[PDB]
Design a protein around this ligand. Sequence first.
Ligand code: HEM
Ligand code: HEM
Lengths: 145, 145
Amino acid sequence: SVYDAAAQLTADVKKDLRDSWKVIGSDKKGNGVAFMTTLFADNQETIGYFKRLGDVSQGMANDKLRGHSITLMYALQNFIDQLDNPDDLVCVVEKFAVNHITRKISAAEFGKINGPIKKVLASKNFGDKYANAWAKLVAVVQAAL
Amino acid sequence: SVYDAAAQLTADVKKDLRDSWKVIGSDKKGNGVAFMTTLFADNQETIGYFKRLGDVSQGMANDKLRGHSITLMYALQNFIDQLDNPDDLVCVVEKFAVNHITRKISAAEFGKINGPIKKVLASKNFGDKYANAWAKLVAVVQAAL
Ligand code: HEM
Ligand code: HEM
Protein backbone atom coordinates (compact mmCIF):
# COMPACT_ATOMS: atom_id res chain seq x y z
CA SER A 1 0.00 0.00 0.00
CA VAL A 2 1.51 3.29 -1.18
CA TYR A 3 -0.34 5.12 1.60
CA ASP A 4 1.16 2.94 4.33
CA ALA A 5 4.57 3.28 2.68
CA ALA A 6 4.19 7.06 2.64
CA ALA A 7 3.39 6.87 6.36
CA GLN A 8 6.90 5.46 6.84
CA LEU A 9 8.33 8.88 5.99
CA THR A 10 8.64 10.15 9.57
CA ALA A 11 10.00 13.51 10.73
CA ASP A 12 13.61 12.34 10.97
CA VAL A 13 13.50 10.47 7.67
CA LYS A 14 12.17 13.56 5.90
CA LYS A 15 14.87 15.71 7.52
CA ASP A 16 17.60 13.36 6.30
CA LEU A 17 16.16 13.34 2.78
CA ARG A 18 16.12 17.15 2.66
CA ASP A 19 19.58 17.66 4.17
CA SER A 20 21.18 15.17 1.78
CA TRP A 21 19.19 16.38 -1.23
CA LYS A 22 20.59 19.88 -0.71
CA VAL A 23 23.98 18.44 -1.66
CA ILE A 24 23.05 15.81 -4.27
CA GLY A 25 20.37 17.98 -5.88
CA SER A 26 22.88 20.78 -6.48
CA ASP A 27 24.45 18.86 -9.38
CA LYS A 28 21.60 17.11 -11.18
CA LYS A 29 23.54 16.44 -14.37
CA GLY A 30 26.61 15.07 -12.60
CA ASN A 31 24.88 13.06 -9.89
CA GLY A 32 22.06 11.98 -12.18
CA VAL A 33 24.44 10.45 -14.71
CA ALA A 34 26.41 8.92 -11.83
CA PHE A 35 23.25 7.19 -10.62
CA MET A 36 22.65 5.71 -14.08
CA THR A 37 26.19 4.62 -14.99
CA THR A 38 26.61 2.96 -11.59
CA LEU A 39 23.31 1.16 -12.20
CA PHE A 40 24.54 -0.18 -15.54
CA ALA A 41 27.90 -1.15 -14.04
CA ASP A 42 26.56 -3.03 -11.01
CA ASN A 43 23.50 -4.49 -12.74
CA GLN A 44 24.29 -5.15 -16.40
CA GLU A 45 21.07 -7.14 -16.75
CA THR A 46 19.07 -3.90 -16.60
CA ILE A 47 20.81 -2.29 -19.59
CA GLY A 48 18.41 -3.95 -22.04
CA TYR A 49 15.48 -1.86 -20.77
CA PHE A 50 17.21 1.33 -21.91
CA LYS A 51 17.47 0.47 -25.61
CA ARG A 52 16.16 3.91 -26.60
CA LEU A 53 19.13 5.68 -25.03
CA GLY A 54 21.64 4.04 -27.35
CA ASP A 55 25.16 3.20 -26.14
CA VAL A 56 24.92 3.93 -22.41
CA SER A 57 28.62 3.11 -21.97
CA GLN A 58 29.38 6.56 -23.39
CA GLY A 59 28.09 8.03 -20.14
CA MET A 60 28.07 11.83 -20.12
CA ALA A 61 28.86 11.93 -23.85
CA ASN A 62 25.48 10.36 -24.65
CA ASP A 63 22.98 13.18 -25.18
CA LYS A 64 19.98 10.90 -24.68
CA LEU A 65 21.42 9.47 -21.46
CA ARG A 66 22.23 12.97 -20.19
CA GLY A 67 18.73 14.23 -20.96
CA HIS A 68 17.23 11.19 -19.27
CA SER A 69 19.50 11.50 -16.22
CA ILE A 70 18.74 15.17 -15.61
CA THR A 71 15.00 14.58 -15.92
CA LEU A 72 15.33 11.72 -13.44
CA MET A 73 16.75 14.15 -10.88
CA TYR A 74 13.70 16.38 -11.35
CA ALA A 75 11.46 13.45 -10.51
CA LEU A 76 13.32 13.10 -7.21
CA GLN A 77 13.10 16.88 -6.80
CA ASN A 78 9.33 16.48 -7.23
CA PHE A 79 9.14 13.87 -4.47
CA ILE A 80 11.13 15.99 -2.02
CA ASP A 81 8.81 18.96 -2.58
CA GLN A 82 5.71 16.85 -1.91
CA LEU A 83 6.95 15.40 1.41
CA ASP A 84 4.72 17.79 3.39
CA ASN A 85 1.55 16.54 1.71
CA PRO A 86 1.18 12.73 1.51
CA ASP A 87 -1.86 13.08 -0.76
CA ASP A 88 0.24 14.99 -3.29
CA LEU A 89 3.28 12.78 -2.84
CA VAL A 90 1.17 9.72 -3.62
CA CYS A 91 -0.32 11.07 -6.85
CA VAL A 92 3.09 11.97 -8.33
CA VAL A 93 4.59 8.63 -7.29
CA GLU A 94 1.74 6.81 -9.00
CA LYS A 95 2.34 8.94 -12.09
CA PHE A 96 5.98 7.87 -12.34
CA ALA A 97 5.10 4.28 -11.43
CA VAL A 98 2.95 4.05 -14.56
CA ASN A 99 5.96 5.18 -16.60
CA HIS A 100 7.75 2.09 -15.31
CA ILE A 101 4.81 -0.31 -15.21
CA THR A 102 4.45 0.20 -18.96
CA ARG A 103 8.15 -0.59 -19.31
CA LYS A 104 7.59 -3.87 -17.44
CA ILE A 105 9.69 -2.84 -14.43
CA SER A 106 8.88 -4.77 -11.25
CA ALA A 107 9.25 -3.54 -7.68
CA ALA A 108 12.25 -5.85 -7.31
CA GLU A 109 14.13 -4.47 -10.33
CA PHE A 110 13.17 -0.90 -9.41
CA GLY A 111 14.83 -1.56 -6.07
CA LYS A 112 18.15 -2.16 -7.80
CA ILE A 113 18.61 1.62 -7.78
CA ASN A 114 19.32 1.50 -4.05
CA GLY A 115 22.81 0.23 -4.75
CA PRO A 116 23.83 3.20 -6.95
CA ILE A 117 22.23 5.75 -4.62
CA LYS A 118 24.07 4.41 -1.57
CA LYS A 119 27.39 4.47 -3.45
CA VAL A 120 26.99 7.98 -4.85
CA LEU A 121 25.95 9.31 -1.43
CA ALA A 122 28.91 7.55 0.17
CA SER A 123 31.29 9.31 -2.21
CA LYS A 124 29.63 12.50 -0.96
CA ASN A 125 30.37 11.50 2.64
CA PHE A 126 26.79 10.45 3.41
CA GLY A 127 26.60 7.06 5.11
CA ASP A 128 24.09 4.28 5.68
CA LYS A 129 21.86 6.61 7.71
CA TYR A 130 21.10 8.61 4.57
CA ALA A 131 21.23 5.58 2.28
CA ASN A 132 18.45 4.08 4.38
CA ALA A 133 16.34 7.24 4.35
CA TRP A 134 16.41 7.15 0.55
CA ALA A 135 15.56 3.45 0.57
CA LYS A 136 12.29 4.37 2.29
CA LEU A 137 11.41 6.97 -0.34
CA VAL A 138 12.19 4.42 -3.04
CA ALA A 139 10.01 1.90 -1.18
CA VAL A 140 7.04 4.23 -1.69
CA VAL A 141 7.39 3.93 -5.47
CA GLN A 142 7.96 0.17 -5.22
CA ALA A 143 4.57 -0.10 -3.48
CA ALA A 144 2.89 1.36 -6.56
CA LEU A 145 4.57 -1.08 -8.95
CA SER B 1 17.44 22.98 -35.51
CA VAL B 2 16.39 22.95 -31.86
CA TYR B 3 19.86 24.25 -31.06
CA ASP B 4 19.19 27.21 -33.35
CA ALA B 5 15.88 27.86 -31.60
CA ALA B 6 17.52 27.55 -28.18
CA ALA B 7 20.86 29.26 -28.81
CA GLN B 8 18.82 32.29 -29.89
CA LEU B 9 17.02 32.90 -26.57
CA THR B 10 18.37 36.29 -25.44
CA ALA B 11 19.40 37.61 -22.02
CA ASP B 12 16.29 39.79 -21.97
CA VAL B 13 13.98 36.86 -22.76
CA LYS B 14 15.72 34.65 -20.20
CA LYS B 15 15.30 37.48 -17.68
CA ASP B 16 11.54 37.71 -18.27
CA LEU B 17 11.18 33.92 -18.19
CA ARG B 18 12.96 33.72 -14.82
CA ASP B 19 11.15 36.66 -13.23
CA SER B 20 7.73 35.29 -14.19
CA TRP B 21 8.60 31.71 -13.25
CA LYS B 22 9.54 32.99 -9.79
CA VAL B 23 5.83 33.61 -9.23
CA ILE B 24 4.13 31.08 -11.51
CA GLY B 25 6.57 28.36 -10.49
CA SER B 26 6.06 28.90 -6.74
CA ASP B 27 2.62 27.26 -6.76
CA LYS B 28 3.16 24.27 -9.04
CA LYS B 29 0.00 22.43 -8.00
CA GLY B 30 -2.28 25.43 -8.41
CA ASN B 31 -0.80 26.91 -11.58
CA GLY B 32 -0.13 23.52 -13.14
CA VAL B 33 -3.77 22.50 -12.82
CA ALA B 34 -4.88 25.92 -14.05
CA PHE B 35 -2.78 25.35 -17.16
CA MET B 36 -4.50 22.04 -17.89
CA THR B 37 -8.06 23.08 -17.02
CA THR B 38 -7.77 26.23 -19.16
CA LEU B 39 -6.53 24.09 -22.04
CA PHE B 40 -9.55 21.78 -21.76
CA ALA B 41 -11.90 24.77 -21.49
CA ASP B 42 -10.64 26.62 -24.58
CA ASN B 43 -9.56 23.60 -26.63
CA GLN B 44 -12.09 20.86 -25.92
CA GLU B 45 -10.79 18.92 -28.92
CA THR B 46 -7.69 18.00 -26.90
CA ILE B 47 -9.60 16.28 -24.08
CA GLY B 48 -9.54 12.96 -25.91
CA TYR B 49 -5.74 12.87 -25.68
CA PHE B 50 -5.81 12.66 -21.88
CA LYS B 51 -8.07 9.62 -21.47
CA ARG B 52 -5.57 8.01 -19.08
CA LEU B 53 -6.32 10.82 -16.63
CA GLY B 54 -10.01 9.92 -16.50
CA ASP B 55 -12.58 12.66 -15.90
CA VAL B 56 -10.52 15.84 -16.26
CA SER B 57 -13.53 17.98 -15.34
CA GLN B 58 -12.91 16.82 -11.76
CA GLY B 59 -10.06 19.33 -11.65
CA MET B 60 -7.93 19.36 -8.50
CA ALA B 61 -9.98 16.49 -7.04
CA ASN B 62 -8.73 14.21 -9.83
CA ASP B 63 -5.58 12.66 -8.34
CA LYS B 64 -4.37 11.55 -11.77
CA LEU B 65 -4.88 15.02 -13.21
CA ARG B 66 -3.21 16.53 -10.17
CA GLY B 67 -0.20 14.22 -10.45
CA HIS B 68 0.17 15.02 -14.15
CA SER B 69 -0.12 18.78 -13.63
CA ILE B 70 2.51 18.89 -10.88
CA THR B 71 4.95 16.85 -12.97
CA LEU B 72 4.42 19.07 -16.00
CA MET B 73 5.46 22.07 -13.91
CA TYR B 74 8.75 20.31 -13.18
CA ALA B 75 9.36 19.80 -16.88
CA LEU B 76 9.19 23.59 -17.12
CA GLN B 77 11.35 23.91 -13.99
CA ASN B 78 13.86 21.74 -15.82
CA PHE B 79 13.76 23.97 -18.91
CA ILE B 80 14.12 27.15 -16.85
CA ASP B 81 17.17 25.79 -15.01
CA GLN B 82 18.94 24.86 -18.26
CA LEU B 83 18.56 28.27 -19.95
CA ASP B 84 22.26 29.21 -19.72
CA ASN B 85 23.51 25.98 -21.31
CA PRO B 86 21.84 25.41 -24.71
CA ASP B 87 23.55 22.02 -24.88
CA ASP B 88 21.69 20.80 -21.80
CA LEU B 89 18.42 22.54 -22.70
CA VAL B 90 18.42 20.75 -26.04
CA CYS B 91 18.93 17.24 -24.66
CA VAL B 92 16.10 17.71 -22.16
CA VAL B 93 13.80 19.38 -24.70
CA GLU B 94 14.33 16.44 -27.06
CA LYS B 95 13.57 14.03 -24.22
CA PHE B 96 10.16 15.59 -23.55
CA ALA B 97 9.59 15.84 -27.30
CA VAL B 98 9.63 12.05 -27.60
CA ASN B 99 6.92 11.79 -24.92
CA HIS B 100 4.68 13.84 -27.19
CA ILE B 101 5.91 12.50 -30.52
CA THR B 102 4.80 9.09 -29.25
CA ARG B 103 1.31 10.47 -28.59
CA LYS B 104 1.22 11.91 -32.11
CA ILE B 105 1.25 15.51 -30.88
CA SER B 106 2.23 17.90 -33.69
CA ALA B 107 4.19 21.15 -33.35
CA ALA B 108 0.98 23.05 -34.12
CA GLU B 109 -1.03 21.21 -31.46
CA PHE B 110 1.71 21.62 -28.86
CA GLY B 111 1.53 25.35 -29.49
CA LYS B 112 -2.04 25.29 -28.17
CA ILE B 113 -0.56 25.57 -24.67
CA ASN B 114 0.32 29.21 -25.44
CA GLY B 115 -3.23 30.40 -24.81
CA PRO B 116 -3.47 28.90 -21.29
CA ILE B 117 0.01 30.13 -20.33
CA LYS B 118 -0.92 33.62 -21.49
CA LYS B 119 -4.12 33.63 -19.43
CA VAL B 120 -2.49 32.22 -16.30
CA LEU B 121 0.37 34.73 -16.59
CA ALA B 122 -2.21 37.50 -16.94
CA SER B 123 -4.03 36.42 -13.78
CA LYS B 124 -0.74 37.17 -12.02
CA ASN B 125 -0.35 40.47 -13.88
CA PHE B 126 2.39 39.39 -16.29
CA GLY B 127 1.56 40.99 -19.63
CA ASP B 128 2.10 40.29 -23.32
CA LYS B 129 5.86 40.84 -23.06
CA TYR B 130 5.97 37.87 -20.69
CA ALA B 131 3.57 35.83 -22.82
CA ASN B 132 5.84 36.39 -25.83
CA ALA B 133 8.84 35.23 -23.82
CA TRP B 134 7.07 31.96 -23.01
CA ALA B 135 5.92 31.56 -26.61
CA LYS B 136 9.62 31.62 -27.48
CA LEU B 137 10.44 28.80 -25.04
CA VAL B 138 7.51 26.75 -26.32
CA ALA B 139 8.84 27.28 -29.84
CA VAL B 140 12.05 25.53 -28.81
CA VAL B 141 10.02 22.40 -28.14
CA GLN B 142 8.09 22.90 -31.38
CA ALA B 143 11.36 22.91 -33.32
CA ALA B 144 11.75 19.33 -32.09
CA LEU B 145 8.29 18.13 -33.15
C1 HEM C 1 15.20 6.66 -8.14
C2 HEM C 1 14.55 5.75 -9.04
C3 HEM C 1 14.07 6.07 -10.31
C4 HEM C 1 13.44 7.22 -10.72
C5 HEM C 1 13.09 8.44 -9.87
C6 HEM C 1 13.13 7.06 -12.13
C7 HEM C 1 12.59 8.07 -12.95
C8 HEM C 1 12.38 7.96 -14.32
C9 HEM C 1 11.85 9.01 -15.19
C10 HEM C 1 11.47 10.44 -14.77
C11 HEM C 1 11.75 8.48 -16.43
C12 HEM C 1 11.14 9.11 -17.67
C13 HEM C 1 9.68 8.70 -17.81
C14 HEM C 1 9.17 8.82 -19.23
O1 HEM C 1 9.34 9.90 -19.84
O2 HEM C 1 8.59 7.84 -19.75
C15 HEM C 1 12.22 7.11 -16.35
C16 HEM C 1 12.27 6.22 -17.44
C17 HEM C 1 12.67 4.88 -17.38
N1 HEM C 1 13.06 4.22 -16.23
FE1 HEM C 1 13.28 5.01 -14.39
N2 HEM C 1 13.53 5.80 -12.57
C18 HEM C 1 14.13 5.20 -11.47
C19 HEM C 1 14.64 3.89 -11.46
C20 HEM C 1 14.59 2.98 -12.51
C21 HEM C 1 15.10 1.63 -12.45
C22 HEM C 1 15.88 1.03 -11.27
C23 HEM C 1 14.79 1.02 -13.64
C24 HEM C 1 15.00 -0.30 -14.05
C25 HEM C 1 15.95 -1.26 -13.50
C26 HEM C 1 14.13 2.04 -14.45
C27 HEM C 1 13.75 1.87 -15.79
C28 HEM C 1 13.27 2.90 -16.63
C29 HEM C 1 13.00 2.75 -18.05
C30 HEM C 1 13.02 1.46 -18.86
C31 HEM C 1 12.67 3.97 -18.51
C32 HEM C 1 12.44 4.32 -19.96
C33 HEM C 1 13.64 5.01 -20.58
C34 HEM C 1 13.40 5.44 -22.01
O3 HEM C 1 13.22 4.56 -22.88
O4 HEM C 1 13.37 6.66 -22.27
N3 HEM C 1 14.02 3.24 -13.75
N4 HEM C 1 12.60 6.80 -15.06
C1 HEM D 1 3.99 23.69 -21.73
C2 HEM D 1 4.03 22.53 -22.59
C3 HEM D 1 3.90 21.21 -22.16
C4 HEM D 1 4.71 20.54 -21.28
C5 HEM D 1 5.87 21.14 -20.49
C6 HEM D 1 4.27 19.16 -21.26
C7 HEM D 1 4.77 18.17 -20.39
C8 HEM D 1 4.31 16.85 -20.30
C9 HEM D 1 4.84 15.82 -19.39
C10 HEM D 1 5.92 15.99 -18.33
C11 HEM D 1 4.14 14.68 -19.66
C12 HEM D 1 4.35 13.27 -19.10
C13 HEM D 1 5.12 12.37 -20.07
C14 HEM D 1 5.03 10.90 -19.69
O1 HEM D 1 5.20 10.59 -18.50
O2 HEM D 1 4.79 10.06 -20.58
C15 HEM D 1 3.16 15.00 -20.68
C16 HEM D 1 2.24 14.09 -21.22
C17 HEM D 1 1.35 14.34 -22.25
N1 HEM D 1 1.24 15.54 -22.92
FE1 HEM D 1 2.25 17.24 -22.54
N2 HEM D 1 3.21 18.97 -22.13
C18 HEM D 1 2.95 20.23 -22.66
C19 HEM D 1 1.92 20.53 -23.58
C20 HEM D 1 1.05 19.60 -24.15
C21 HEM D 1 0.02 19.93 -25.12
C22 HEM D 1 -0.35 21.33 -25.57
C23 HEM D 1 -0.56 18.74 -25.50
C24 HEM D 1 -1.59 18.50 -26.42
C25 HEM D 1 -2.11 19.41 -27.43
C26 HEM D 1 0.12 17.68 -24.73
C27 HEM D 1 -0.25 16.32 -24.73
C28 HEM D 1 0.24 15.33 -23.87
C29 HEM D 1 -0.29 13.99 -23.75
C30 HEM D 1 -1.43 13.37 -24.53
C31 HEM D 1 0.39 13.38 -22.75
C32 HEM D 1 0.12 11.98 -22.19
C33 HEM D 1 -0.76 12.05 -20.96
C34 HEM D 1 -0.94 10.70 -20.30
O3 HEM D 1 -1.61 9.83 -20.88
O4 HEM D 1 -0.40 10.52 -19.19
N3 HEM D 1 1.08 18.23 -23.90
N4 HEM D 1 3.30 16.32 -21.07
